[PDB]
Structure 1
């Protein structure tokens, strides 16, 4: 591909990424660092501040239980929203809607988890995570200190995010990276791998040029970012095993179960 076509693809994905997702990394960083002019987020650091944050912020999430469960269900509620946002974004990826419909379903099914982890890092620092489009901030130490298996379920997300954020990618970088994850030709059950790798080869070309122009000083950043797809594959399988352990230990309305299946 000619470089001007790669740049056009990079911008097409950036513009769609801005429309699809509620809180960009650029805004998230201004909040976390405290450089923004907007109001300080509500901070949840323990039981009583969580209670006020629900009565203050309008948590649609569960808020119909026990605190560790309620938080867990808040992460699931937001993840369900993120899947729809990613599904919408994927449609803007040139070539995606022309794929066999079953393959589109399969690529989203196996990709959304890796993309959620990746984009969750945009909302985290070493001390906590933004919530509710940035109106709130809940501390890492509070999440890490939840009882039984919940504390150990939260912390791996921060340990990854802290590592991923040291690459210092911005939104224009992430927009292409996310597209590369979706167009993975090795997902189980794909019917027609060739046009998926064909598209990914083009996204990879655009990612490489984007990182060289946007980060001329960061050597082999392309490779370092692809190496992070190893971090992603491993933590997602670990994650699946942690949910399976939770289910066998911790009922919900059958309709709710369907929603979260």
Structure 2
């Protein structure tokens, strides 16, 4: 493709990225750094401030169970279900995606949303915590990591990944292409027609390659390093699923079957 074509693809995905997701990376950076002297976020650092925070921000996943670590865990689910729809709608704007076989569209989203949620979560994290509720709350890493039994071990790898991933210093225009590449992976099991998916992903890769050289001209092999990250993501997604397994085996949680179906 000609370079103006790639530049157009990049700006199309960036524009669509901005409209699809509730809090961009640029905004989240302004919050985490204190740069905006605007309203400081409500900080959740312990049990009492989690109580006060629910009552203040009036969270939408409230009145679920009772144990605090569980409540937090299930609010991670609530946000993930939301994220899934946000990525699904973003997908529709990747050139060519809607023209794929409907089953292949569903297969790509199904196996990809986990990796994308991990990635975008890093935009909302620093070494000390994570923005929640469109940047209005900030929940500390230490309070998450110190949750009881397995829940503490479940939250901390997200921060461990995010800190490493954020060292790349990608911005939203970088991430919008990167997200698209993940979605268009032709190696997802059960794809009926791999060829047009790789054809799209090749245009996306070309666009990401050129976007990274223009936007990070002094970051050698940033393209390569970012693809290596896409390696890890596969691994962390697998570790993650084997960790949701133990909780359902050991703790076994909610009862409302309808609720469980939404989170199926």
- Deviations for 1:69-117, whole angstroms, at most 9, x for unmatched residues? 0000000000000000000000000000000000000000000000000
State the Cα distance separating 1:37 from its structure 2 match.
2.9
| Unaligned segments of structure 1, at least 5 residues | none
The match for 2:117 is: 116
The answer to whether the 8 Å contact 1:26/1:170 transfers is yes
Q: Distance in 1 between matches of 2:20 and 2:183?
A: 15
State the Cα distance separating 1:63 from its structure 2 match.
2.8
State the Cα distance separating 1:230 from its structure 2 match.
1.4
What is the number of residues matched between the two proteins?
261
Is 2:29 the partner of 1:29? yes
SS in 2 for 1:248: helix
Q: Distance in 2 between matches of 1:159 and 1:142?
A: 15
The match for 2:58 is: 58
Q: Distance in 2 between matches of 1:63 and 1:42?
A: 20
| Unaligned segments of structure 2, at least 5 residues | none
Q: Distance in 2 between matches of 1:206 and 1:38?
A: 36
SS in 2 for 1:134: coil
Q: Distance in 2 between matches of 1:173 and 1:202?
A: 15
State the Cα distance separating 1:33 from its structure 2 match.
0.4
The answer to whether the 8 Å contact 1:13/1:175 transfers is yes
Q: Give the root-mean-square deviation of aligned CA atoms.
A: 0.6
Between 180-189 and 57-66, report the one with greater CA deviation. 57-66
State the Cα distance separating 1:58 from its structure 2 match.
1.5
State the Cα distance separating 1:38 from its structure 2 match.
1.9
TM-score by length of 1: 0.99
SS in 2 for 1:138: strand
Structure 1 runs (4+) greater than 6 angstroms displaced: none
Q: Distance in 1 between matches of 2:119 and 2:79?
A: 14
- Deviations for 1:5-39, whole angstroms, at most 9, x for unmatched residues? 00000000000000000000000000000001320
SS in 1 for 2:36: coil
The answer to whether the 8 Å contact 1:62/1:73 transfers is no
The answer to whether the 8 Å contact 1:117/1:157 transfers is yes
The answer to whether the 8 Å contact 1:62/1:77 transfers is no
Between 251-260 and 88-97, report the one with greater CA deviation. 251-260
Between 156-165 and 36-45, report the one with greater CA deviation. 36-45
State the Cα distance separating 1:252 from its structure 2 match.
2.2
Q: Distance in 1 between matches of 2:244 and 2:230?
A: 21
